[model samples]
Target: MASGVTVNDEVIKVFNDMKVRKSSTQEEIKKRKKAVLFCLSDDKRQIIVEEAKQILVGDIGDTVEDPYTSFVKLLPLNDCRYALYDATYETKESKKEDLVFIFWAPESAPLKSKMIYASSKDAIKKKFTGIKHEWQVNGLDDIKDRSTLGEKLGGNVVVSLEGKPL
Candidate 1:
């Protein structure tokens, strides 16, 4: 079961910080980061954080940069990678936040790189626990828009007022 890949300590720390709540008050509460991108080191033996972004809370009409947009832009078109995205959405009742684990193995990447990423996937997943959703993206179309991902996450389910299928 040895994949010859290991997760870095910094990756663990970042995930812990994202999961744990430090305070109760809104002002004191630590703002959650939007996403974390992981990639293999130059030697291909260690997984490290390539980038991370914080959520920018602002007014309703304020124009703040979209972290999801940046996350997609950061993904290499011809490489394999792993990423954790904090997906926030609204339900009929209240707001919800879920941690999403992404396995990005583009079709154009080398077979060897894809194999390495596939094998090392479990190592990263085992280290970073508590992920609510998982995605395997092999093409640009799979991740072209938020609505596409939302559909995969069951965001389009429909029901009647009494909780029965329409």
Candidate 2:
């Protein structure tokens, strides 16, 4: 399912034959706003690298190894979900649950799979351990996907990033 195989067929087969799909490795990007990450990684590499259970959002940037492998993701949080900032991500300073900063993340990152904290700083102190939750993105409006990626987003953009029928 990682290469030329039809993703739809692979997805359906997983349930019919019992298979645990791979995780998504796209950069967690904001749905709105402006960002510029000057890195040195392959932009095409930003595409989904594994199997996923929901719609996976891809960032608009790449990675760099200038200092250490710097992965840059170009994404901005949409103003709509901005209200959920308090419930979004962990803060870096004041260790408290303040979803004030909208966020996007790798599905299998340490920050993604860590325990939920009451504050962003707590999350920071916890140091972005495990990034396990599925992101709710809505930027790619062309492809229609079967994964549950559209559930967390709210907007008029195309529900599918790959342009498939939703």
Candidate 3:
């Protein structure tokens, strides 16, 4: 639906919808997180953009130049309790995936600080692409792994040079 109008329209609709649905409580966050997951699971620019706009609109603004890229970086983060590192769009070194480091603490899950790896939509798109994006988590374990990653990460801060001093 990149007919320009449809792509742009759905994104705007998602943002305006979120503008009305905004909330910060932990319960509300989980609810929004579910919306992100549902949207990303479909991987259509039409659907995902709609969801991404809601998930990230307040943070990224509705008019950023490369919203699709920013939205891709945000796909893996299904939790609303997080912030992306600044300079998120500066450069993407890896060819297949781009990353956005995040810090989040879910009410029921672990407190987390980690990088989220998003598969390249541009590359995928050029390949007569299938999924718009596929996310890979660089930190946090599977639900089956329980607290292995979390406990190891819980005691101290994890930060890059661009990140606030640890």
Steric collisions counted per model: 0, 41, 0
* Residue 99, model 1: Cα distance from true site in angstroms: 0.4
lDDT preference between candidates 1 and 3, better one:
1
90-162, model 3: which lDDT tens digit per residue?
1234111122323233334322211110222222233222222222233333322322222222332333122
Q: Write the per-residue lDDT of candidate 1 for residues 48-136, one digit (tens) a residue.
A: 87645434333212342334545566577888887566555555675455566788888899887777777678877776667776777
lDDT of 2 by residue, 1-166 (tens): 1331111222223232111212122222332112112111133212111321221123213322111011112232321111011112122332111111223332343432121211232322232222223243333231122122322332224333211223
Task: Give candidate 3's error at residue 24 in angstroms.
Answer: 22
lDDT for every model? 0.60, 0.22, 0.29
Candidate 3 lowest-lDDT run of ten: 112-121
Candidate 3 Cα deviation (angstroms), residue 2 = 16
The window of 10 residues in a row where model 2 has the poorest summed lDDT is 65-74
Candidate 1 has an lDDT of 0.60
Return the clash pairs for model 1, or none: none
* Per-prediction TM-score to the true structure, in the order listed: 0.73, 0.17, 0.21
